């Protein structure tokens, strides 16, 4: 069976409530959505991104995509990245990979008949997950009723944004931390919003306030020396992590000398066929590894990964993913356990929801 | 006086021959053209790439620029790259803010009444250049044609590609060594087509069989070790070259430290504003700058960098801006020099030629 | 479907022909071959080493694989090297868990009805080979007989034993290169023998004798600073290539550092599942892998290694794994192409002569 | 347009009280100050130092100034750095090549018609600014007054100097931040006056103390060792600043690596010229930019610095140029805005003044 032809549209979701973090505002989310058709079935994938990203599959991808074995997603991954050379890989380009890779696999899957979770190496039944919000934009109750749902359903991890009104962060994660107890893991995210020294009196002051174990892109991330600088210098029992940005496996490498904790996203660091890679450094590295955002498709591949500590389970996304498919899984307990009767990822798109949405 | 308008639009122009290189194949180019209107006057920039690139100026760029201080480009850039860190800062992203901003500075030039190069902080008359082509797929005949065309025009560097099929190659520059003579420099280019040990093998036997002095991107460019070998470990009077896409300042300074020569595009880099910014690496690092690609940008952009040893005139792009635009530059006599009786970049687009390669 | 027994063997085949290399002689080949049965179905897989292997699988490993899901081997393999803390994890333990897990890939992949490539990601449809021998005890007719067999045969690599008596060297690589020809490459192999300012001299000396492009374990397997020295230091054209010692990942990452091309034995580093990390440490390090030994495993497993240069068809296994089982791959033409007909490995134990060289 | 004539005159203006830091005792200011006379038109550029700063414009600055054309200062100040290499390129040399360098700018921005801010690239509209000086030699009422005045005009942050009798630095740290308010940021400036583990003992000290957040030269700035020490060890929140006297690119490339916060004087770095790269190096390194001293200058220089956190608006030197000078800005709000309605520096020497202060 050969890959027949793909097809890509984009949605763009509002959010339910005007958002922001340390370093942005937004108040929608934009979904590229590829779906590839061979052997008489069919899968699909996504990025979040650019509407741009969709022109860019259809116009480098779909070429190198059709015609190619529908049983191998690994060896269209590498045409796809050799053919996007002048195009640009890391970015938007990246993203169009992504998608194209996670429908591929998804396509294969479906041509087995197997979960997507059961055609990959698979180290784990169930994935961990920490609930994630809690943006700079939330006043403190809907901050403490986020994350304290999160923690009434058996989600006992849960992260926050600080470092947009660094002056306002001390009450915030004080409301945080009164509102989940002492049992909860809480987790804070600057986005990159504070210079290196600004990050270091933070990591011990958020420590001492309300006793955070988890200190995401501190700095700006670009800023590889400043991350260093602020895993040899933080507090203890603060982990130290990064890497949503990293667009390629050579600069994965570079960040895992940097943090305490390694970080990727299924839908900017190459779709699952790149994501398989971030074991082999992480373990190398002898650093724990955890997935950023787009919770559906990365349930299914971080079950491949040996690192693994948890996976994101990201508002927005997961917001949006139920809202435009069937068959998303839900985080009840801590964890999510892909549907071992479901081929490939177990996931339909809602047509008539989805057309309503249309970029 | 603002910024009213951008228009975006993409031309393709098929190559006069198929043509290659180490790593990639190609027999068109796609040049995507920003328009900004303001003040009573209009600048124009481009970059070249993926079509997708239009769209993402349309989509995430326009809407920062319309509306903005004609007079201040970098304000609107610090903006374009503050706005784009969802939807792909590198690659397409970068390409289109590159766009983005030599438009607009050829509006600032422009509503100044002056050409580009005067309105920039300017430390060159004119610029020397070095013609570039020599593909891995001409016959011996066109390759000789094409270098000795240049040479005997007075420009007394040339480039030609290497490193598709090796075994070729030592009767290649041997040919090329042949058409220009011993007074012409020769330059080579592999684009990442060797391992370490293979280029460094390649940077003695070409300096033996014909006397080369430039190595261009002997291994991939992410591999900043394997560089770093080349660097220490080639022969004297052959400079290690490198540098067309990074995307951030912290990427070319770690570049800096492992080459002889740092290269960036215009298109790429960030624009006008990202390049103004090339010769404080430069310069603190003691490193000399070439522009890669792009000729009619950069006979302007590269007066305002100090550090500058030359220009690529780029065969692809030399053809595609003497076929779209009325005002391009002769690199006879081995530079160029912009026109002082044109204002901005003195480029206009032939508008008749235009439909006809519209995308 | 559950794993049920394991059951453990041994077999001791004689050598065709005395053998050496540059630190050891040897005249027989050990294989330890575990059977894994559950769900109807069987899988096998194979370590070569010492008969203590065997026990030690009984021993540390039965009581972990036996009752396990047989649908998700590195949940197992996790499992298994958690056991061995005490017990010892590299060497004997590591070969021990390489066995055990290469059967229980062969026994998810046949519970599937897939070949076992297509149950792992998959880069590459078959996979190009060097023939391996030339040891230092033979005659240099019988030399030149191996190498030159392999040439006519349509394989365009080879690779011979050197260091043993460095005065007799030069004659049988100019011998060996007077029997392939230009068009073949030639490899070497010390086996650990040389100091490093020795190991520098035969680098240049077996270049300018006879176009060596590779040269592995220069010097002893534990000296890293050797080998990154011979890597800086060594000439153009050959590549510095070692790590068929080592056991983990995490040593890996140490080598990986050091060398022109990393090599891993899939009996040694932790069967598939270990296998499957590699392509991650590579891809990040930016460098060339290469499959050491057991050519009958490595032609599935190196399918899904992105980065693989070649594998090595060693002499010794390609013989006893011909003698011992069914199914085995022909390399004529220079690659090992997985029989997609086949579920599994392949691979069938030849009751009768497994019965005659019972260990 | 060519630069007809430069006219070189000094002038001292005694302090209005005596003033003292860490390291020196002083009672007056000189500036020298040049004026560029071409097409028309005046540009006025000075720098404070000795007297024979003047000398040296005359002996080696005024012959390669005069007859350039008027519209490139940059090519002007790379002729005059190359034509200083015997007459000592550093200090005094600097501090000559800075004025000249801004009076050509202060005439091209005039020949413009424009103020200078619009004549440079520009990313800010206006500039944030700190009050600076707090002189070891203030009792502490005269200490607190000048500080308070700042708070009490809007300026939200001051820096004063400490390390002279490091004994009595506790009461006074502690009287300026009773003086000032919790809101106003405590800045410090030791000018090199400790040695390394006295000064990691006061970068503690004065944290607990009176929550400064900034320590300026707290060892000799030549000592880059000690300056990386008190970066890598120094509290939380204190940033690290260091810059005042590097007069090479590749200098503040050194200390761009050893502190927080990268400073650079306009009438030292080489001017306007100089201060134009000093970008590439601040967003290199992901530090910010703080300007030093000469603040009617870098009001507008400034505009043109992406990485600027802020400028100093030093006492001795705001006073000087209110003194001698119509047009300088009024700082009241904590910012300094380049006045639209003004072109070049918006600087006229008022003649009677002048007379009175001739050196
Ligand atoms: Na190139
Ligand atoms: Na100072």
Same mark, same amino acid.
């Given at each position: 069976?050969?890959?027949?032809?793909?097809?890509?549209?984009?949605?763009?979701?509002?959010?339910?409530?005007?958002?922001?973090?340390?370093?942005?505002?937004?108040?929608?989310?934009?979904?590229?959505?590829?779906?590839?058709?061979?052997?008489?079935?069919?899968?699909?994938?996504?990025?979040?991104?650019? =509407?741009? =990203?969709?022109?860019?599959?259809?116009?480098?991808?779909?070429?190198?995509?059709?015609?190619?074995?529908?049983?191998?997603?690994?060896?269209?991954?590498?045409?796809?990245?050799?053919?996007?050379?002048?195009?640009?890989?890391?970015?938007?380009?990246?993203?169009?990979?992504?998608?194209?890779?996670?429908? %591929?696999?998804?396509?294969?899957?479906?041509?087995?008949?197997?979960? %997507?979770?059961?055609?990959?190496?698979?180290?784990?039944?169930?994935?961990?997950?920490?609930?994630?919000?809690?943006?700079?934009?939330?006043?403190?109750?809907?901050?403490?009723?986020? %994350?304290?749902?999160?923690?009434?359903?058996?989600?006992?991890? =849960?992260?926050?944004?600080?470092?947009?009104?660094?002056?306002?962060?001390?009450?915030?994660?004080?409301?945080?931390?009164?509102?989940?107890?002492?049992?909860?893991?809480?987790?804070?995210?600057?986005?990159?919003?504070?210079?290196?020294?600004?990050?270091?009196?933070?990591?011990?002051?958020?420590?001492?306030?309300?006793?955070?174990?988890?200190?995401?892109?501190?700095?700006?991330?670009?800023?590889?020396?400043?991350?260093?600088?602020?895993?040899?210098?933080?507090?203890?029992?603060? #982990?130290?992590?990064?890497?949503?940005?990293?667009?390629?496996?050579?600069?994965?490498?570079?960040?895992?000398?940097?943090?305490?904790?390694?970080?990727?996203?299924?839908?900017?660091?190459?779709?699952?066929?790149?994501?398989?890679?971030?074991?082999?450094?992480?373990?190398?590295?002898?650093?724990?590894?955890? #997935?950023?955002?787009?919770?559906?498709?990365?349930?299914?591949?971080?079950?491949?990964?040996?690192?693994?500590?948890?996976?994101?389970?990201?508002?927005?996304?997961?917001?949006?993913?139920?809202?435009?498919?069937?068959?998303?899984?839900?985080?009840?307990?801590?964890?999510?356990?892909?549907?071992?009767?479901?081929?490939? %990822?177990?996931?339909?798109?809602?047509?008539?929801?989805?057309?309503?949405?249309?970029?």
């Amino acid at each position: 069976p050969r890959v027949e032809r793909l097809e890509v549209s984009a949605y763009t979701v509002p959010t339910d409530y005007p958002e922001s973090d340390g370093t942005l505002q937004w108040d929608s989310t934009t979904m590229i959505l590829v779906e590839a058709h061979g052997g008489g079935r069919k899968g699909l994938g996504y990025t979040y991104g650019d =509407v741009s =990203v969709g022109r860019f599959v259809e116009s480098k991808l779909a070429g190198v995509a059709e015609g190619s074995d529908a049983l191998s997603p690994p060896a269209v991954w590498a045409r796809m990245q050799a053919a996007i050379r002048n195009a640009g890989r890391p970015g938007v380009g990246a993203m169009a990979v992504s998608a194209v890779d996670i429908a %591929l696999w998804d396509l294969k899957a479906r041509l087995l008949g197997l979960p %997507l979770a059961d055609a990959l190496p698979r180290f784990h039944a169930e994935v961990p997950v920490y609930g994630s919000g809690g943006f700079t934009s939330y006043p403190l109750r809907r901050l403490q009723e986020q %994350l304290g749902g999160w923690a009434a359903a058996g989600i006992p991890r =849960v992260k926050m944004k600080v470092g947009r009104e660094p002056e306002k962060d001390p009450e915030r994660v004080r409301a945080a931390r009164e509102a989940i107890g002492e049992s909860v893991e809480l987790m804070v995210d600057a986005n990159g919003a504070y210079t290196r020294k600004q990050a270091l009196y933070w990591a011990g002051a958020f420590a001492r306030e309300a006793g955070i174990s988890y200190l995401e892109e501190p700095v700006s991330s670009e800023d590889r020396e400043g991350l260093r600088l602020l895993r040899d210098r933080g507090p203890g029992g603060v #982990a130290i992590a990064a890497g949503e940005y990293e667009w390629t496996l050579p600069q994965l490498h570079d960040l895992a000398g940097c943090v305490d904790i390694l970080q990727a996203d299924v839908t900017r660091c190459g779709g699952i066929t790149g994501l398989l890679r971030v074991d082999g450094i992480c373990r190398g590295h002898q650093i724990p590894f955890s #997935a950023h955002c787009a919770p559906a498709v990365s349930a299914h591949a971080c079950c491949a990964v040996e690192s693994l500590l948890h996976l994101e389970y990201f508002h927005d996304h997961a917001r949006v993913e139920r809202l435009l498919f069937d068959g998303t899984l839900d985080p009840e307990g801590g964890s999510l356990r892909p549907d071992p009767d479901r081929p490939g %990822l177990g996931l339909e798109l809602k047509r008539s929801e989805a057309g309503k949405y249309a970029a």
